[PDB]
Paper text:
The simplest TCSs comprise a sensory histidine kinase (HK) and a response regulator (RR) component. To address this question we have used the TCS DesK-DesR from B. subtilis as a model. We had previously shown that the HK DesK, a member of the HisKA_3 family, undergoes important conformational changes to switch between phosphatase- and phosphotransfer-competent states. We now report the crystal structures of the DesKC:DesR complex, trapped in the phosphatase and the phosphotransferase functional states.
Upon auto-phosphorylation DesKC adopts a strongly asymmetric conformation able to transfer the phosphoryl group to DesR, its downstream RR partner. Comparing the conformation of the phosphorylatable histidine between HKs performing auto-phosphorylation, and the phosphotransferase complex (this study), the His residue shows ~180° flipping of its imidazole side chain. During auto-phosphorylation, HisNδ1 has been observed to H-bond with the ultra-conserved acidic His + 1 residue, which corresponds to Asp189(HK) in DesK. Once phosphorylated, the His disrupts its contact with this neighbor carboxylate group, stabilizing the P~HK species and leading to His χ−2 dihedral angle flipping.
Residue numbers in the entry:
A (entry chain A): 154 to 328, 335 to 368
B (entry chain B): 165 to 260, 262 to 269, 273 to 301, 304 to 353, 355 to 357, 361 to 369
The structure:
């Protein structure tokens, strides 16, 4: 009634705690990978730059040689990092749009999309969740529907980004990606609804603004 | 089970995106700076050596600090030293012997390092002497117990050697840590968890 509160909050608290443990586990895993790559390179840079400083007067040529070495190892280390950052990032929704056009065309399914109410600003996290859901919704159309047409709408409506994926095929079986998407969306305080009357239509919403 | 699995995967992902931004900014920037300054510094070796030296002291500082955090996160991590020794002994046994191990978390860095040293020596002895063709690491009550068994033949004489040898070395080091070493029919080493 009003204890429903005390409870929802103990729930909030435990979720947060579980949260920081998983979070930390990941942070450490990454810290080990970084030490394992960049570690020796950074130490080397330090050493050589120190040695080089020592040789400025004594052996200018040897110092320049050393600084060339420093330059190379800093360059390549910077690469390791660019790669990692890119890898750790996600898929932009505009890029996923292009992937699904290619996939639907390759499957001989008509793709209907017109940009309307494109989100003004969405968090990179929520954008990446939506990209993942959009990919799966279309994988399902291709694998199961036997559709000839697929309609995708991506709109900012009220305080949500709403994606609808509809097809004119037939829904297969009775009550995996559907639970996967719903769980991912619900974790983001979003929702997933499915209508299987005239083919299959997925409505996925996630908060924004 | 997945219910909790896949949610935790979502938290990791988020975390992963966050670290990604942080890296980009801090470390990516520090490496670019290092490159720049080291290049400028090279340019000044002859024309302005004093400047070149200052630049180089700076590069030194930014390289040293560059992984501080990472270094810290890994510095306070328990399980690693022994987890790395596990990898070394797999390599050594393969280069020599079938290795049988199945994962079975909390100790002290000191006691972990003592165990790594003993594990290395136990396996060096297997490789050098046994002519063998199994390692257990378990947290039992308030001890960490490591067993290293082999299917070769024991080569030791009536006496259990002395100074300059690993068996006495391991026993002495373990016993000083309030641990134990027992041993040849067909090594059990224990150390207290926190002390
Ligand atoms: N667009 C669509 N059209 C027709 N049937 C669909 C559909 N999307 C899903 N289905 C039906 O719902 C079922 C469950 O879908 P879901 O995505 O969860 O698993 P799946 O069969 O695609 C394997 P996975 O998702 O692990 O790749 C499918 O097996 C299919 O019968
Ligand atoms: N796993 C094993 N299998 C067979 N014999 C072993 C063995 N471990 C030890 N031994 C025997 O016990 C003896 C004493 O071992 P110990 O480790 O103390 O010295 P060592 O011969 O390895 C030189 P050091 O230990 O200084 O490197 C060995 O010389 C060998 O005969
Ligand atoms: Mg599916
Ligand atoms: Mg020995």
């Amino acid at each position: 009634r009003k204890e429903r509160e005390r409870l929802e909050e103990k729930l909030e608290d435990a979720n947060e705690r579980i949260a920081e443990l998983v979070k930390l586990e990941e942070r450490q895993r990454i810290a080990r990978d970084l030490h394992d790559t960049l570690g020796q390179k950074l130490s080397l840079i330090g050493l050589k730059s120190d040695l080089a400083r020592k040789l400025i007067y004594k052996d200018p040529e040897q110092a320049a040689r050393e600084l060339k070495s420093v330059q190379q190892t800093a360059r390549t280390s910077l690469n390791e990092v660019r790669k990692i950052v890119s890898s750790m990032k996600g898929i932009r929704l505009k890029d996923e749009l292009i992937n699904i056009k290619q996939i639907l065309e390759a499957a001989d399914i008509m793709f209907i999309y017109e940009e309307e109410k494109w989100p003004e600003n969405i968090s990179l996290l929520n954008e990446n969740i939506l990209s993942m859901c959009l990919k799966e919704a279309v994988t399902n159309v291709v694998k199961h529907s036997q559709a000839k047409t697929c309609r995708v709408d991506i709109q900012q409506l009220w305080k949500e980004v709403v994606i609808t994926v509809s097809d004119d095929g037939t829904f297969k079986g009775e009550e995996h990606g559907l639970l996967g998407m719903r769980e991912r969306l619900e974790f983001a305080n979003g929702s997933l609804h499915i209508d299987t009357e005239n083919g299959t239509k997925l409505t996925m919403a996630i908060p924004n603004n």
